């Protein structure tokens, strides 16, 4: 429930988030994330990004003008199937003031759990499939710079290094 | 590729249909299928039911009033995930003058190919989710009598025996 | 009980049980006429008001309710039936669904009144119709079981809708 | 036949057979009525006129022979009798004797008309009494078999007189 | 004479029924065998199924409408010949709330004795063939589960164990 | 497929008929069998009676008014059961311009093959059971004069002797 | 006795016995006549009413029942017969069957009347026919024994039919 | 053959022979009738006119000769006789004597007509009487042989008269 | 060519009539056959019925008015198929003063040869059919009293017997046969 | 019930048709049978020719003017007798744009059943006896080219092979059988 966005070289971000068990009254965690997300002008957020190794993901395609129920909460998700047609779009990420291009499938077939424990199945496509794929990768210790282009990773190496240095200058 | 509708004890109704390869200019196959279903007045139809051992499923929830592209066509489907809530619904089949309840999941995550061989991802729910599942089973040799309720399979027993005998007079 | 029950309810499929104590609960038969009156219906059995008791009530003139135009049939039994059958259109209070059912036209009958006394009657009529619908409720038989292959087929989606609607009893999901 | 038969005749103890040909033997039914009107009785059955067939007729108002009051019942069956019973006086064209007999008040019946049409009826009262009497005739049961121990006794002489009178046969 | 229909596990159901001697005045045995069957809503019955280990077999192809002389009765029977052509049909049994597909020869040639002791010869074919063979197998200690397919045997395991549980409460 | 009614003494009528194998395209043999029988005004007939040592039996219970499929055909018959009750009836035979009383059981339970060779199972009762057993004996080299009574065999002595000498005129190279 | 016997009875093959008591059982002779009249038969003998006695009765004009046109014969015996014979078509009441038998034209008869007295007589015509039929019956000879190959064969089905019906009578199993 | 032979003539004691040729010799039967007519006799047999042949003829009404009323019997033979007997006065054309004899009343007969044809016949009465008289003639039996002990003794005188006439 | 009708007990009426060969110069056999027919008030006639053991049959449906070529002639006949539908009619014969019911098929498929020799095929139905099978039966030695009903066979026995005695006067110079 | 006329090399044309059983509510079968015969400009038709291996024969000897009750129908036929006199007439058959002479007897004795199953017996003579004989052979799987003449069968070899070729284009995704 932290007011802590985390940054690139923190090793939590590379860990494996754990399955959520008790599905009740910690929707406050889901609130903390959203709050953090809303104030960091971000589109999506995973729990690892606020120091919680839990398989939680949220987002809002319209965060620029917040509204409950335009919000999308996905507990313990999995990608059941995915398309063949892929797409190189641009992505950013609240753990990186960086931005670049990453190729991911266009359409994802999903299974997940709601805020009270109930399973759902859904096809996400559009900007929703883009952010799911992003935020789902956080839950597995994959960052978007792992999926980035050889060119772009090079085109962004200095700011990867700066982020590495600001981290370096911190430990108790 | 027939106007030959099949009936219960045909051993083709038990063989596992094979995957479709030549995905063009044999929409007449699917056209035959629709016709035999239309005149027999029934909601769905898979290829095995017209003596073609191929992975083709078609249907139309609105069959009292025929309409193009109100028709559903599914080549080479597969069930990638299914709901947890299941529902006991009365069901019918063109290869059985019989009807009765079978319990199947309510919603299903689908993956199939269209008539031109393009893959699609889809969440089928409700009545459309019911028929798909009936027809998918035909592609796998599963008949709806195998999943029926103990009360119904008993209530329908004489009719089933009736149909076996009728069929056995196929040979003399 | 002001509980008409809807289709998929498992009580409608149980065997209704013989009335033993044949006196002073008449309000049970009154609860029944009252629901059947209020629900705009012609006949009523106790399983339809969630009571597994072999009781059957009706009124060919229910759009003009009048006592003693009311018929009560406790612990009934069909001793004979006419060989001539009739295909009439039926409905039921456990279903917003409708279809043609074929039942013998006339039925020889035996039963017991509100007081405990046995009787013998030849029900021929719409009385013969209803008795036969309502007796079946007492033995877990419902009119869709006797409906025609075609009306059965036609009425499948709606029947399923009631299953979906009913399944929403444990649907806090 | 203008053959009224009397008590000790053994035909009265046989079992009468079901009518097969329902037509042009309403004459048999006419003489049963004829005999019956001529001997001042209210019921009669075919064995009583020396015909071993399941035919029963009556008229509860035999003191004014009115056709529309006449009742024919061919191949009868008692489908149900009542619980409550009744001791009523009874006589018989086959016996100049009289007395009480206990029989159920109301009967549920099934029989065929003079042309063979099957009907279902509840007889109660005077007609339930006669039927039950007359039905017994078709089974080889006579009313003295069911008589009260008091009356059977009080009716010893007459019965023995009838055995006497009948024995003219072979006592020529 | 017993209203003791037996169930799967009882040991009498596996003994070899003994040949009927004294072919008379135990017609009630047969009647009480029909009685039991009639109330159990069953198509056929053998004597061991009512705890009499005698070689008696009865049935009615239309038990759903009970008429006499629609009743078939077979005493001390044997199968003199049987068809080569065989048939899988779905069978049930009054000793088992269970059901399965059993393959039997289609036509049998029978020799038997009736209710009076006279040997008869008959070719039973069809639905009368099925039932005879079922019930005959009771006279030999064969049960229908002995000839079920593996699949159906497995598929009905729990109920066979359920019936064995229930039985052990005899010696509770 | 011969028009050869054979008569009493012929040695082949005492032979054991062999079992049929080609169960197709030889209907005419059986048709000729029927034909021969018809023009001889006879009730039943088996293949040896037309000089064919094959296990084949036919008859028409109503041959004074012939109809197709009113005729009966049995290929490779066999007797699976038979009644205890016997019955003494008068029989005739096309092989013998003779008649007499032979006891055979009332009912026989049977198995055979059709014109196409599918096995059957039938109960013959009555005249069908009477004729069957007459014609089945032929397939086994059993003629009805064996199963007769001493009376009816005596009473028929001189016609068998006429038949025996008629037969010796197959090779009548002498005035006898 | 009303016991008309039919073909396959064994009694019809037995040797009847000589009448001894020649009095007051003359109604047995009438019984025979009655049996004959209702079965529309021209003749009849004691074996065929199931009486193994030597009695022969007939009325050659039986279409007109008339006493003294009837002929009774007790303990007959044939003493002479014509060299000349006749093949006439006969019936017998023990068979629904018909056929030709070659019997001599005229026979010379010795017999006894109802009361025991002997008579000598010459039978000629149809009376000679019938006598020789009925006399044969009293020696266990049937007319199928004197029939012709051709006629014997014509009536074979009918004979077997009668044999069936008989074996049946005793134990219709 | 004319004159009726009388009693002691030995021919009346020889057995007559069966006729073979049922011929156009009805003249033989006719003479017999003539002779029989002119001696006012009811019966005659061929022996009596010296024809040892088995022919018996009569006419119960010879009083008025009527051809159809005549009875011929060639080669007769008795085949049965009545048990009841009868004593009747007999007379014979070979004797002026007369007396009672006891024969059966009725006879079952067999014989041959004028053409060879065989017949069977029940003779009763006077034809039964006369047949039995003339049949004996065929067998050389004479009616005094069967006569009563009474009448035989009673008439022996007259037989002696006949016996004497036989002389010269 | 005989002018003699025949009667029941003649033994020739039970002899198998022979097949005709020489098909010419004997129209008079047929003529005399017809000649006999009219004068003996009978509808048809077969050759054995005039003492000729040869397979010939002739008739006239309308013979109460003689009309030549309204005649019908059938040499060497053979019945090749018959109706399934049977019929009972009162039949009679010129060899009997006797009449009764006989059951015969309604329609018949025939084959026969003409007076010149040529073969023919014809379906005969009704009364022609009826007359055909009577006269045809004669040619095989079958007489309508073989096919007579049990009732009419019995009802006519005296008569049939009477006809036998009648016939026995063929050799009756003797007295042992009466009339 | 097919609008499928079949051609020469079809093997069904050589099969022996089965005996028709259920004689009701299959008048359409016969009607379809008739329908294709008028549009294929033809005089005769048996059921194997429309791909029904059943013993059915129909014809109309005036089809240039189609008239009901001028149509002839023959269920389950047989030939009980045939004429001795024979005749070479020109024939053709709808499973062939081909024609030739075929010697068949002139007249035939027949038996069959109508549309309801009543056994009839009949004499066919002329155009009727010709069509029947042809059409009947189809039910026994005999084709007119088997009875065609030595001259005419050789004269028609080409067209017979063309149809063998053209039939072979049934299984011809293989183009070498274009004709
Ligand atoms: Co991120
Ligand atoms: Co299906
Ligand atoms: Co209801
Ligand atoms: Co009474
Ligand atoms: Co069982
Ligand atoms: Co034989
Ligand atoms: Co007799
Ligand atoms: Co003298
Ligand atoms: Co004639
Ligand atoms: Co053709």
Task: Look up tokens 């009657």; give the residue.
Answer: C121
Bridge partner residues of I56 (DSSP): I75
Spatial CB neighbours of I15, under 8 Å, sequence gap ≥ 6: I48, I53, I141
How far is the C-alpha of I57 from the C-alpha of I53, rounded, in Å? 12
Which two structure tokens, joined as six digits, stand for I44? Answer: 């048809």
Q: Which residue stretches of I51-176 are H helix?
A: 127-139, 150-154, 157-168
- Asked if J44 and J134 touch (Cβ cutoff 8 Å), the reply is yes
Pick from E111, E119, E123: which is nearest to F121 by CB?
Answer: E123
CA distances from J174 to B24, B26, J164, J166 (A): 20, 19, 15, 13
Q: What per-residue string of b and e applies to I88-97 under the rule 16 or more CB within 10 Å gives b?
A: eeebebbbbe
How far is the C-alpha of F46 from the C-alpha of F73, rounded, in Å? 10
- Taking CB atoms and an 8 Å cutoff, what residues of chain A touch B109? 80-81, 109, 111, 121, 123
Q: Which residue of H has its CA nearest to I172?
A: H117
Residue B130 is inside which H or E element, if any? Answer: helix B126-138
Task: Look up tokens 């997300």; give the residue.
Answer: A37
Chain G interface mutation, best of F41, F60, F87, F154, highest count of G Cβ atoms under 10 Å = F87
Please count the residue pairs, one from chain G and one from chain I, whose beta carbons lie less than 8 angstroms apart: 28
Contact criterion met (CB < 8 Å) for H80 and G120:
yes
Nearest to H106 by CA among H131, H87, H125, H90: H125
Strand locations in chain G, DSSP E? 43-45, 55-58, 71-81, 85-92, 95-104, 106-112, 118-124
How far is the C-alpha of A124 from the C-alpha of B121, rounded, in Å? 10
Long-range contact set of residues I128-132: C-beta below 8 Å, sequence gap at least 24: I128/I59, I128/I61, I128/I72, I129/I83, I129/I104, I129/I105, I130/I87, I130/I89, I130/I91, I130/I104, I131/I43, I131/I44, I131/I59, I131/I61, I132/I57, I132/I74, I132/I77, I132/I79, I132/I108
Interhelix angle C156-167/B126-138, nearest 10 degrees? 110
Pick from J80, J83, J84: which is nearest to I109 by CB?
Answer: J80
- Asked if A2 and A158 touch (Cβ cutoff 8 Å), the reply is no
Compute and round to an integer the Cα radius of gyration of chain D.
16
How far is the C-alpha of J176 from the C-alpha of J174, rounded, in Å? 6
- Taking CB atoms and an 8 Å cutoff, what residues of chain B touch C153? 41, 92, 99
**At the topology level of CATH, where does F1-176 sit?**
Peptide Deformylase (3.90.45)
Classify residue A170 by burial, with Cβ atoms within 10 Å: 0-12, 13-18, 19+.
Answer: exposed
CA distances from F42 to F37, F45, F60, G157, H121 (A): 5, 8, 9, 13, 50
D80 catalytic? Reply is: no
- Taking CB atoms and an 8 Å cutoff, what residues of chain C touch B91? 156
User: How does DSSP assign C72-95, residue by residue?
Assistant: EEEEEEEEEE-S-EEEEEEEETTE
CATH superfamily of C1-173: Peptide deformylase (3.90.45.10)
Q: What per-residue string of b and e applies to C44-72 under the rule 16 or more CB within 10 Å gives b?
A: bbbbbbebebbbbbbbeebeeeeeeebbb
Distance F47 CA to ligand 6 centre (A): 10
Written in H, E and C, the secondary structure of chain J is CCCCCCCCCCHHHHCCCECCCCCCCCHHHHHHHHHHHHHCCCCEEEHHHHCCCECEEEECCCCCCCCCCCCEEEEEEEEEEECCCEEEEEEEECCEEEEEEEEEECEEEEEEECCCCCEEEEEEECHHHHHHHHHHHHHCCCCHHHCECHHHHHCCHHHHHHHHHHHHCCCCCCHHHCC
Nearest to E88 by CA among B163, F118, B138, B143: B163
CA distances from H97 to G24, H74, I155 (A): 50, 27, 63
- Asked if D100 and D78 touch (Cβ cutoff 8 Å), the reply is no
How far is the C-alpha of A134 from the C-alpha of A43, rounded, in Å? 11
Which two structure tokens, joined as six digits, stand for I152? Answer: 């009419």
- Asked if C124 and C132 touch (Cβ cutoff 8 Å), the reply is no
How far is the C-alpha of H129 from the C-alpha of A171, rounded, in Å? 179
Q: What per-residue string of b and e applies to B93-109 under the rule 16 or more CB within 10 Å gives b?
A: bbbbebbbbbebbbbbb
Q: Which chains touch I (3 or more CB pairs under 8 A)?
A: G, H, J
- Which ligand ends up closest to the CA of A48? 1
Classify residue G146 by burial, with Cβ atoms within 10 Å: 0-12, 13-18, 19+.
Answer: middle
Q: Tell me whether chains H and D touch (3+ CB pairs under 8 A).
A: no
* Backbone angles phi and psi of D15, in degrees to 5: -110, 125
- Asked if C78 and C108 touch (Cβ cutoff 8 Å), the reply is yes
Q: How is the beta sheet containing A119-125 ordered, strand by strand?
A: A44-46, A56-59, A72-82, A107-113, A119-125
Strand locations in A4-85, DSSP E? 44-46, 56-59, 72-82
Chain F interface mutation, best of E82, E112, E121, E129, highest count of F Cβ atoms under 10 Å = E121
CA distances from I76 to F64, I46, I53, I112 (A): 21, 11, 12, 5
Angle at the Cα of E54 (from E48 to E55), degrees rounded to 5? 95
How far is the C-alpha of F100 from the C-alpha of G160, rounded, in Å? 11
Query: Given the DSSP bridges, would you call strands B96-105 and B86-93 parallel, antiparallel or unpaired?
Result: antiparallel
**At the topology level of CATH, where does B1-172 sit?**
Peptide Deformylase (3.90.45)
Bridge partner residues of C22 (DSSP): none
3-state helix, strand, coil in chain D (%, to 5): 35, 30, 35
Dihedral (Cα; I58, I59, I65, I69), 10-degree rounding: -60
CA distances from I78 to F62, H73, I44, I48, I116 (A): 21, 59, 17, 16, 17
Bridge partner residues of A122 (DSSP): A110
G103: left (phi over 0), alpha (psi -120 to 50) or beta: beta
Report the gap between the CA of I53 and the closest CA in chain J (Å).
Answer: 27
* Catalytic residue positions of H, numbered: 134
Residue F127 is inside which H or E element, if any? Answer: helix F127-138
Which two structure tokens, joined as six digits, stand for G45? Answer: 């003998």
- Asked if E117 and E23 touch (Cβ cutoff 8 Å), the reply is yes
How far is the C-alpha of H68 from the C-alpha of H66, rounded, in Å? 6
Compute and round to an integer the Cα radius of gyration of chain C.
16
* Catalytic residue positions of I, numbered: 135
- Asked if H11 and H3 touch (Cβ cutoff 8 Å), the reply is no
Which residues of G lie inside 8 Å of F (Cβ-Cβ)?
149, 152-153, 156, 159-160, 163-164, 167, 171, 173
Helix (H, G, I), strand (E, B) or coil at E47: helix
- Taking CB atoms and an 8 Å cutoff, what residues of chain B touch C173? 85
Pick from B88, B97, B127: which is nearest to C157 by CB?
Answer: B127
Q: What per-residue string of b and e applies to A112-130 under the rule 16 or more CB within 10 Å gives b?
A: bbeeeeebbbbbbbeebbb
- Asked if G57 and G33 touch (Cβ cutoff 8 Å), the reply is yes
* Backbone angles phi and psi of G9, in degrees to 5: -70, 145
How far is the C-alpha of E144 from the C-alpha of E129, rounded, in Å? 15
CA distances from E87 to B98, E93, E107, I164 (A): 21, 18, 10, 69
- Asked if F89 and F104 touch (Cβ cutoff 8 Å), the reply is yes
Pick from C82, C83, C120: which is nearest to D122 by CB?
Answer: C120
How far is the C-alpha of H15 from the C-alpha of G135, rounded, in Å? 38
**At the topology level of CATH, where does H1-168 sit?**
Peptide Deformylase (3.90.45)
How far is the C-alpha of J83 from the C-alpha of I121, rounded, in Å? 8
Cβ neighbours, 10 Å, residue A62: 10
Classify residue F58 by burial, with Cβ atoms within 10 Å: 0-12, 13-18, 19+.
Answer: buried
Pick from E87, E92, E106: which is nearest to B157 by CB?
Answer: E92
Bridge partner residues of E121 (DSSP): E111
Spatial CB neighbours of A53, under 8 Å, sequence gap ≥ 6: A12, A15, A16, A17, A18, A47
Which two structure tokens, joined as six digits, stand for A55? Answer: 């398989």
Nearest to J123 by CA among J87, J91, J82: J82
* Backbone angles phi and psi of F133, in degrees to 5: -65, -25
Cβ neighbours, 10 Å, residue C85: 10
State the DSSP code for I52.
-
CATH superfamily of I1-179: Peptide deformylase (3.90.45.10)
* Backbone angles phi and psi of H77, in degrees to 5: -165, 130
Nearest to H130 by CA among H52, H72, H83: H72
Which two structure tokens, joined as six digits, stand for F26? Answer: 């030889």
How far is the C-alpha of G161 from the C-alpha of G168, rounded, in Å? 11
Spatial CB neighbours of D53, under 8 Å, sequence gap ≥ 6: D16, D17, D18, D19, D28, D46, D47
- Domain-wise residue ranges, chain E: 1-172
* Backbone angles phi and psi of H37, in degrees to 5: -65, -50
How far is the C-alpha of H152 from the C-alpha of H160, rounded, in Å? 12
How far is the C-alpha of D94 from the C-alpha of D43, rounded, in Å? 11
Angle at the Cα of G155 (from G151 to G160), degrees rounded to 5? 145
Nearest to G54 by CA among G95, G20, G83: G20
* Backbone angles phi and psi of G126, in degrees to 5: -95, -15
- Catalytic, out of D102, D134, D161, D172: D134
3-state helix, strand, coil in chain C (%, to 5): 30, 30, 35
- Asked if E88 and E50 touch (Cβ cutoff 8 Å), the reply is no
How far is the C-alpha of H14 from the C-alpha of H140, rounded, in Å? 5
How far is the C-alpha of I122 from the C-alpha of I108, rounded, in Å? 8
* Backbone angles phi and psi of F25, in degrees to 5: 65, 25
D75: left (phi over 0), alpha (psi -120 to 50) or beta: left
- Asked if B103 and B86 touch (Cβ cutoff 8 Å), the reply is yes
Cβ neighbours, 10 Å, residue J15: 13
HSE of E81, CA atoms in CB hemisphere, 13 A: 21
Helix (H, G, I), strand (E, B) or coil at C54: coil
Nearest to B8 by CA among B97, B92, B91: B97
Nearest to J110 by CA among I124, I111, I109: I109
Nearest to D99 by CA among D150, D164, D162: D150
Query: Given the DSSP bridges, would you call strands J72-82 and J86-93 parallel, antiparallel or unpaired?
Result: unpaired
* Backbone angles phi and psi of F94, in degrees to 5: -75, -25
Spatial CB neighbours of C19, under 8 Å, sequence gap ≥ 6: C53, C54, C55, C74, C75, C112
- Asked if B112 and B128 touch (Cβ cutoff 8 Å), the reply is no
* Backbone angles phi and psi of C40, in degrees to 5: 70, 60
- Asked if B167 and B7 touch (Cβ cutoff 8 Å), the reply is yes
How far is the C-alpha of G166 from the C-alpha of F129, rounded, in Å? 18
Distance D162 CA to ligand 4 centre (A): 15
Helix (H, G, I), strand (E, B) or coil at I113: strand
Bridge partner residues of H112 (DSSP): H74, H118
Q: What's the resolution in A?
A: 2.8
How far is the C-alpha of H18 from the C-alpha of H23, rounded, in Å? 13
Which two structure tokens, joined as six digits, stand for F46? Answer: 């088996």
Nearest to I57 by CA among I112, I5, I100, I106: I112
- Asked if D109 and D76 touch (Cβ cutoff 8 Å), the reply is yes
- Catalytic, out of G134, G161, G172, G173: G134
Nearest to E155 by CA among A66, I32, B153, B85: B153
* Backbone angles phi and psi of D42, in degrees to 5: -100, -5
- Taking CB atoms and an 8 Å cutoff, what residues of chain E touch F83? 119, 121
CA distances from B78 to B131, B136, J133 (A): 14, 8, 60
Nearest to G41 by CA among G93, G4, G110: G93
Cβ neighbours, 10 Å, residue I4: 11
Bridge partner residues of J100 (DSSP): J91
Query: Given the DSSP bridges, would you call strands E86-93 and H118-124 parallel, antiparallel or unpaired?
Result: unpaired
């Amino acid at each position: 429930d932290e007011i802590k966005i985390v940054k690139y070289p923190d090793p939590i971000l590379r860990r494996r988030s754990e399955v959520t068990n008790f599905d009740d009254n910690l929707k406050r965690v889901v609130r903390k994330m959203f709050d953090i997300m809303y104030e960091s002008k971000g589109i999506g957020l995973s729990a690892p990004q606020v120091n919680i190794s839990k398989r939680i993901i949220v987002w809002n395609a319209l965060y620029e003008k917040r509204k409950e129920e335009n919000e999308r909460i996905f507990i313990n998700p999995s990608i059941v199937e995915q398309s063949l047609v892929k797409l190189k779009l641009i992505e950013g990420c609240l753990s990186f003031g960086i931005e670049g291009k990453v190729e991911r499938p266009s359409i994802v077939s999903i299974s997940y759990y709601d805020i009270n424990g109930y399973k759902h199945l859904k096809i996400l496509k559009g900007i929703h499939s883009r952010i799911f794929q992003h935020e789902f990768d956080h839950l597995n210790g994959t960052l978007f710079i792992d999926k980035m282009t050889q060119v772009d990773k090079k085109k962004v190496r200095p700011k990867l290094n700066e982020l590495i240095r600001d981290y370096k200058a911190t430990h108790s």
